Symmetry: C4
Subunit: 342 residues, 4 copies
Amino acid sequence: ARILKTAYTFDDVLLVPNKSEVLPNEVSLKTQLTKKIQLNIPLMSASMDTVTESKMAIAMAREGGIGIIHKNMTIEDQAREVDRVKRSGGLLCGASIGVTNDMMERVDAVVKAKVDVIVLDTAHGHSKGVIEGVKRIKAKYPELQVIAGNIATPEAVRDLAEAGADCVKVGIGPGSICTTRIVAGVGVPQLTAVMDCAEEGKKLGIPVIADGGLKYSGDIVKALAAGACAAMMGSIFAGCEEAPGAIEIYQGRSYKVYRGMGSLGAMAFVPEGVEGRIAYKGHLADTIYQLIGGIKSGMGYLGAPTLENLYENANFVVQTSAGFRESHPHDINITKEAPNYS
Amino acid sequence: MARILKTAYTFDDVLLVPNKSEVLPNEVSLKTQLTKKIQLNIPLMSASMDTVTESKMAIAMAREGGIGIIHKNMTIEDQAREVDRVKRSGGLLCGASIGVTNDMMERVDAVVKAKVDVIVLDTAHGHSKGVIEGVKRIKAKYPELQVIAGNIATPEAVRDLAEAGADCVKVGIGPGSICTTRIVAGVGVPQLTAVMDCAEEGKKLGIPVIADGGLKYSGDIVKALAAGACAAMMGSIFAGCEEAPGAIEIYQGRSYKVYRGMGSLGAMAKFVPEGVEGRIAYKGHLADTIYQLIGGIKSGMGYLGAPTLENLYENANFVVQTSAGFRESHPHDINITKEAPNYS
Amino acid sequence: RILKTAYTFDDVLLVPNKSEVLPNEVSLKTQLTKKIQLNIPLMSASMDTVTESKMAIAMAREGGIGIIHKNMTIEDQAREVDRVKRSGGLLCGASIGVTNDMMERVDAVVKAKVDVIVLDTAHGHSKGVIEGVKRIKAKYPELQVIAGNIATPEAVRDLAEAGADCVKVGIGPGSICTTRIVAGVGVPQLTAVMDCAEEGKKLGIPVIADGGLKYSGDIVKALAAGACAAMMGSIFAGCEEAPGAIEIYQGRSYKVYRGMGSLGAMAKFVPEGVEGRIAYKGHLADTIYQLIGGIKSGMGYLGAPTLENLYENANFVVQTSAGFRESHPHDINITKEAPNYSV
Amino acid sequence: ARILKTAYTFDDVLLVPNKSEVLPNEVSLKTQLTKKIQLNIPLMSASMDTVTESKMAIAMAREGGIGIIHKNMTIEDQAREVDRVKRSGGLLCGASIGVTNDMMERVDAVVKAKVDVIVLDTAHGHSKGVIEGVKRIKAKYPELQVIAGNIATPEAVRDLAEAGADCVKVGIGPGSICTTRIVAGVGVPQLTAVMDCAEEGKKLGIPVIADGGLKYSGDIVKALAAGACAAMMGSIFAGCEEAPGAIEIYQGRSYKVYRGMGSLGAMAFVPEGVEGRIAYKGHLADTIYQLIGGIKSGMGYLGAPTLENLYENANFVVQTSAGFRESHPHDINITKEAPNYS
Ligand SMILES: C[C@@H](Oc1cc[n+]([O-])c2ccccc12)c1cn(-c2ccc(Cl)cc2)nn1
Ligand SMILES: C[C@@H](Oc1cc[n+]([O-])c2ccccc12)c1cn(-c2ccc(Cl)cc2)nn1
Ligand SMILES: C[C@@H](Oc1cc[n+]([O-])c2ccccc12)c1cn(-c2ccc(Cl)cc2)nn1
Ligand SMILES: C[C@@H](Oc1cc[n+]([O-])c2ccccc12)c1cn(-c2ccc(Cl)cc2)nn1
Ligand SMILES: O=c1[nH]cnc2c1ncn2[C@@H]1O[C@H](COP(=O)(O)O)[C@@H](O)[C@H]1O
Ligand SMILES: O=c1[nH]cnc2c1ncn2[C@@H]1O[C@H](COP(=O)(O)O)[C@@H](O)[C@H]1O
Ligand SMILES: O=c1[nH]cnc2c1ncn2[C@@H]1O[C@H](COP(=O)(O)O)[C@@H](O)[C@H]1O
Ligand SMILES: O=c1[nH]cnc2c1ncn2[C@@H]1O[C@H](COP(=O)(O)O)[C@@H](O)[C@H]1O
């Protein structure tokens, strides 16, 4: 037992403005998901059964990003959804794999469906199972892009890079539907965990991904400046028409079902997630336009023409509970709906 | 002079950091040494309050691998009969509460004859003369008897109680969900920091520590254990269970059980109170509640790559979280529409 | 030019000590000044909604002392003081403003046999207070004078040299205060009392903790911080011995309570206080019984037979906002009302 | 990517009372807006469309400070507003200029109408556009007084001072209607933001304007004690009757529309501000009277007869959230309304 440090999340921190020569319209958002794979926008959608299936992956890829088809469907149906995505336009497609007995069975299936990236995700990425699971997959298909998750420590990044992972997913406990930190007392405040594993990722030359904890466009900006190659989201996308689950109406307003993959309903081990509903946002292209527009804005403040240039010249400052109340709209009664704020 | 020492944390303040794991949750073991003789299977205890643990809860707790401490608010006669009812119920572990009183020996006499397994000498201020001389007096008449002394919050207290002959120390001044000691007396050390300190001084003297109070989740236990505690004691968590002495009241179709502190006005009426009196939601049976606690503990231990509790304490690293992180930890920005068995 | 982080009572917690003494074995005798002794270290605020004759008579019997407010006629204040004094040798205090007729107001209450005088202005570390205390101690060398309010140990020196026998500490910690908000000035009360007490010990002058004391536990902290006595208005404001008839609002009972720098009380300066209602606490004796019990309990925890030993042995600990949540009752719907804890 | 330090705001700190030979009435609140322009009170109405126009500018100047006519109108109309203020008894007047294609000819027109001060306010003053812009204005009108903003860092003060700016506006994200820190992640908590810029402005000889995040009169004192020469408020003034817009009744209570210059309404796209309604203050003169009462009283505590004596001898102290709770009134049911607290 030893208390090492104080760790921070996104709303603990703020990016200090830099001398700018670029405006939000000239900066680029292209990023390298892995060595082979690059994205025109650094956004991914979460490998969950209430966020991403065929229709969502196609939309995300059509916006320059990429989606990860979840793993709560039968093997036959998983390669089939991958098939639908790759067929229409030859877009980027991701498949979620679990450390199971029929692991190589799915991996063999979606590889046949010409998937771009296998991402195997678990609750505990720094484990004996996932490591050898990566080696097993990477042995059969050496050129296949593997993304392993989830971890929260730089030591974990080392062993996954050693195992053969071409990318890493960072974040234990920061999910909006997550209860891991509550029912297991385990996790690292996302921001600290990200820049800890991102810096360790730069040294070995592997990209890391921030997963969960993002509410606004400004949080993604902080994640990127912390060294993250991309950001994966669930709640921001779950209320979009391209997301699975029908529309439910309660008290006049429209909703979509959203739940963790470790909640009681999804696993149909004690639950490490909850189930609820999220506000229906409309079409994805309208949400992404705001997210992209917000990122370009922040990078313009920090005078970064590229995402590489952002990580190098970004400085963080820590705010308190007082500073956090100042950072949000205050002392006014909001009467008109903003497209990027509550 | 008045000295400001340091910042002290609780369980909501901190987070454990995932280690490399060769271990799955369904594989770890939660065995512990409550004392040198007594070895619990699961590291859970039930509080010795009149709204948590009578013979019913004690039998249920012992059956699940834990232990129950029968409260002392009843008569010496009525308590010995309670302890007995647990002991002759199938070789189960049982404990009884005592206080620094005049009939302290008469009560210890009664429960020792009821073949009680452990003795809990729990008071408001465990680091006092009355508790120290009390333990020495009990031990003088009953050497082989196992004694737990409380409540403490300092390493200095551990040494004095260990010097007196305590077999285990109970740590916690103010973490109680029904407690108002920190509010009316201004005295108390935030539980996590207090647990760590007493654990450390406890290891060196070869005497285990009990984490009492401040826990409302499974993660709180994982932090309590990783901080060097052998067992965690809970009242609020088990008070909602059907094996609790409280009767099932109903408010607006929802069912509740009454829960009060032993220093609350009602509990003392049997006045300057250091506790409050209220009601909590009815949970159901204990074994269903415990099954959720163990599943959370075993899940957390799988994260720190610990097969045993001793391996957890040795290989545990804590990270301090801000309030901003605390909000991120709990499920946020979602209207939860289905009740989870282990979160509310 | 940011010095440090300063704490209030809620930021801090007292660490238990080895104790060979029980809560009812401890003594609350204290030293208000060199010559004035209190059986309990509690004083009632000199406000128009808190302390007049009836309150001061009640505080004195219970062991403490009451300070009659100066928001009235010089004749009246001496009339109030006389009522308290002739009631059987009870300690009585009279607050004095720093005004043109400062002395004339004083002369009246020393004739009515007042025991202590307090010179309370919004800023006790100024020219008026300092030369004021000297003007008073010149005519009355034997009269016990309390000056305030201050928040710096530098101000303790300035007032101790002036001739003040005691200093009152607290800038903007009051329940009705807005000084920290409208002026931006003030020092968190635990830090303020700790600093001024230490410098007070070096000079041999008692300090008074004034404002921001919601609970009996807060009093234990201030006493452990070095304060000779605590002063509160919010606590005693609802009591029946306090000025003001009972207002019935929404079926419940209240008394009016307001700052002396509020628009209501000051009837050119901008308001530095608010005006409000506080629940009717019944009689005074009930409330102080709880307070004394809370103080006596905390001293039992810290192994303190006297208030002196308390200060010498006190260890403090800073708690985060998370510890503050587990300090108060949590995870329970409280039904029965606590006579010493409320929400 | 590294964390710099803890940046505080006004709710984070407290001023410590010094010895005082001066009563609040005996203090002077005069300042230097630039080296050439002086104010009798360090107050300044914000340059937004819903707070300051000719009615407000005259009202502000009549009370002691300046009002700055917003730039959300035609060049002709703005030159006429400046005209309405100047001919109205030779009062101090401020126009507002942005980095735009018609920027120069706009500056030409307001200079013609004898505007006393130009403010070049953009979302990001530490940029190529603003630096080049200030260069041009001083080139054409060497003696014209120009303020530039907004900034948050010392380096930006130097860069603006180098370009000939007579004064700089400090504040990235502290506004009451602001959503910049939320959408971009960019910002510096106003107190240390002002303090660091003020310290470096006093090394060069350039004043700084504490902008935004000022709720109370005490917050203005803290700003002045940190080194700021003047404070700028929109939220405090948008509710007065001299402000633009008609009064609104919602609950039988009077309100006025307050919107950010980067909100959907003001722009006519990605917004950086919100729109809403503020409570109706009434007449500005009675509002200013309360703010002057707070500043002079705060200086009375600090024994400051002047604003420079204030800065020279001002010690700050950080309070926690427990201290913040103690600062505001507590445990009381406020029956009657105070003029300076709500
Ligand atoms: C209950 C369920 O929870 C989850 C199920 C699925 N996902 O993706 C999860 C992600 C993060 C946290 C928990 C998740 C689950 C948890 N575990 C699990 C728990 C602990 C460990 Cl060490 C290894 C695996 N295996 N299944
Ligand atoms: C959305 C809008 O925001 C604003 C528009 C106008 N004003 O005056 C603003 C003042 C403070 C903060 C934001 C403001 C706006 C922002 N930007 C903008 C933002 C960043 C950069 Cl690097 C360059 C330009 N261009 N227009
Ligand atoms: C008010 C009541 O509170 C309690 C009464 C009974 N028990 O078991 C308690 C346990 C923990 C905390 C408080 C308890 C009580 C407190 N004390 C007490 C308080 C301080 C000291 Cl030093 C010694 C005894 N004596 N009775
Ligand atoms: C508004 C009113 O406030 C008060 C007026 C009267 N009293 O006794 C007060 C006591 C404590 C706090 C404020 C008080 C008041 C404040 N001041 C005042 C303010 C600042 C200074 Cl430096 C000196 C005096 N003059 N009148
Ligand atoms: O059942 C769960 N428990 C904990 N974390 C989960 C669960 N399901 C998904 N997650 C994680 O949470 C992320 C989404 O979080 P959000 O975008 O903040 O809503 C996913 O991409 C996963 O990494
Ligand atoms: O009246 C009281 N005052 C203070 N602490 C109490 C009182 N009654 C019980 N406790 C403690 O609070 C613990 C229960 O903690 P909980 O699980 O948070 O309710 C018990 O095991 C006791 O140690
Ligand atoms: O109008 C005021 N402004 C600021 N402080 C005040 C005012 N009136 C009284 N006080 C102080 O507040 C103390 C009581 O504070 P409370 O006990 O927290 O209500 C009094 O003893 C005075 O020192
Ligand atoms: O759309 C906007 N976004 C962010 N800040 C703004 C916007 N419009 C005006 N501001 C700034 O916010 C300040 C007002 O702060 P307030 O008094 O706290 O409302 C103005 O002086 C501007 O400098």
